[PDB]
Assembly symmetry: D2
Homo-oligomer: 231 residues x 4
């Protein structure tokens, strides 16, 4: 059976570019979105047109019990996921003393609760494939160095890095690599970027696609920055 | 007058060592504990015996509304804090598939909601002192490199680093430095050790005062050009 | 056709890089210090893969000889679109026991190698007016240091600094400059590697090949570790 | 009393380090490449603070001279408990425009300086049987690179790798080995282009003072910093 990869937030933007590149690489790809159902179906159709199998799942990554039920049912129907790309996240920018409770909690939970809620039901189905696996998280340059107006987002994306590195250590014995891709400023003050432009969605997706390939078998526990030389 | 520093989790261990070194350096130091009131009052009397003023505050850093009321009342009675040391944290170790919801949620929130719940009521009072300031968070080598059985704690302590660096950028123009201290294996962490000592180049656990000395240095006036940093105190582990 | 110089490509990691870049569609120029027959065999393999190839022989420490050979090669065959700098050797020993030669050979082969090879090639690369690729090979010991390798750790760390600075100078010409830092590669720390095995040469070469590809256009100034999760 | 060598200590950051260490109670040996009268001024200030001091003259690149002077000094005054390596120069320029001298003198002064100064002093330090302190001075350019400084970035990054490796070799001797990486500091002979670019990026919006760097070195040389080793500590106003 063909190896299948889940990409969260894959109805548009970076997530969609990742989904399409993984399909072109020969993976079956399961699309996900929180609410844009018609958009998710368009991506499913494009993946099918590439010759792979696809369908979409709808959930808010913060809804722990609903995510568990949807993923357990999907694994029962279609087998375990060989790969998981955790792409969905959220910003609520503002100066730290001006941040509301919602600005803080929604940003923290979407990245960190999302990591737990999506990956917890899928670790054992991945191990049961007995063929290794791939987990890639999407952080941010702000998770590496911090950013004004983004104490919450910098915390959420930095926490993702720590979770990724720790999980890489736990799953290494099962040949599951676990890595993080940290984009800079992407199209979806450029005076600080050495390449002097925003990045394109495919320039991020190509890195995720490489890490998901069999060729990247000795890369794990890493944060790979795709940021045009910003840091 | 005398600059005052809040140290969370200072009734014992590393937090206590930090509070006593900061008192010896000439700060007034406010002690904090979640629930061990008698322990906290003992540290208060030690700080008084070291020549500084002290009292304790009791709260769970996760209780957002309670923390705000307690800190806002304390600032009204005693003035803004010049410094805040965020030392209190929590572990719930276990392999990622073994972790319970509570194991995950309590570890993430204690560090990350603790940061928001304690610092949000205190940032503007600190700025209004108009004399700079100091914020030091306590992370962990696990936040830098990850650790087996600690996916939750690694995420919490790495998240603290991101928050620290971003806050450093916002507060630099007020001459408030914001830094992180990341201890390795310290004598107050209960372990069963022989493998860990083989990984540490110095081949021994750190002592509480070896961590507190770094925090004390960052809080000093001499550390005025150090901000946005993670300083590891780990015997060479990484 | 874009042409890439790979130093030290008659065997080992350098050979695997040369062959992967040939399979990707680049013309590849092979290099060796002295093993001429070995270099010719790699050239013949690149030709059998359908690309043009020849070899160049030089000690990377012979500054003037390197300049003459490379300037003549660029006049005969055009500027290099890419350069993979794979230059270094170890002379392990306790620091106070290292000889002058142990220190100077290790420092110079990596850092004078960088200067001696790249200085004559930067302007011919820019004059192609089509971007470019530079990849240097460092080591995990350049990132974190290693007992018995104060000299090698210094040389490898120095390559990382030179790479990051050169990335800043060349970004405006759309030349990316990156570093690949291998861990323990097959060419007893195994209880220390999470994947519990040495890397294979193609697991390093795959990362170099990805960085040289058009897809990697927003990645620059980076050190990418291929070390099985060692750090 | 414990004795510390500080190289390049006749002026600037090195002088600030030497005076802060003397105030902390170390005997301090001053070093300079060529300015003998400048060095003697610092010696006299350290003596006035109540510690023992003298100066040593050498180019850190002249390997055999460094070895003879240092081994003679250790025979006369005992081993050094601490060494602060403050060694390096810049020769800025676009990489294709760097001359052989621009490259070689920048690489060698930092990396050859590390080997030339420290190799004769490691065993005398170990033979004290009371631990020790080694601190190297790198730069933010060694951590992230800088335009016009491919040579300096390489030299200062190399210093970091050497420091971390030596920390591992000496950890069981209770000798800590660390690196301090200043950002843009007053008195630093830097180009206007490097200086203007740095100011816009520094969150504190100012250059550092020499004592803001020396205080970090002094802390690492103190007995309290005994569990800090293998580290690079940035003193850069938040630049990175």
């Amino acid at each position: 059976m063909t190896r299948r990869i889940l990409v969260t937030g894959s109805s548009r933007g970076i997530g969609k570019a990742i989904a399409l590149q993984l399909a072109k690489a020969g993976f079956d790809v399961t699309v996900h979105a929180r609410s844009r159902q018609a958009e998710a179906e368009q991506v499913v159709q494009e993946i099918q047109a590439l010759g792979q199998n696809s369908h979409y799942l709808m959930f808010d990554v913060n809804e722990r019990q609903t995510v568990q039920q949807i993923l357990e049912q999907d694994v029962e129907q279609h087998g375990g996921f060989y790969g998981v790309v955790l792409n969905a996240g959220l910003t609520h920018d503002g100066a730290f003393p001006a941040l509301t409770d919602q600005d803080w909690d929604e940003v923290i939970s979407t990245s960190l609760d999302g990591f737990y809620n999506v990956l917890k039901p899928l670790i054992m189905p991945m191990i049961h494939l007995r063929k290794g696996g791939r987990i890639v998280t999407l952080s941010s340059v702000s998770g590496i160095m911090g950013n004004r107006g983004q104490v919450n987002y910098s915390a959420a994306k930095a926490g993702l890095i720590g979770a990724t590195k720790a999980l890489a250590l736990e799953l290494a014995k099962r040949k599951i690599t676990v890595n993080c891709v940290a984009p800079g400023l992407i199209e979806t003050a450029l005076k600080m970027i050495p390449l002097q432009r925003m990045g394109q969605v495919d320039e991020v997706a190509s890195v995720v696609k490489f890490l998901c390939s069999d060729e990247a078998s000795y890369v794990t526990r890493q944060v790979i920055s795709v940021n045009g030389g910003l840091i």
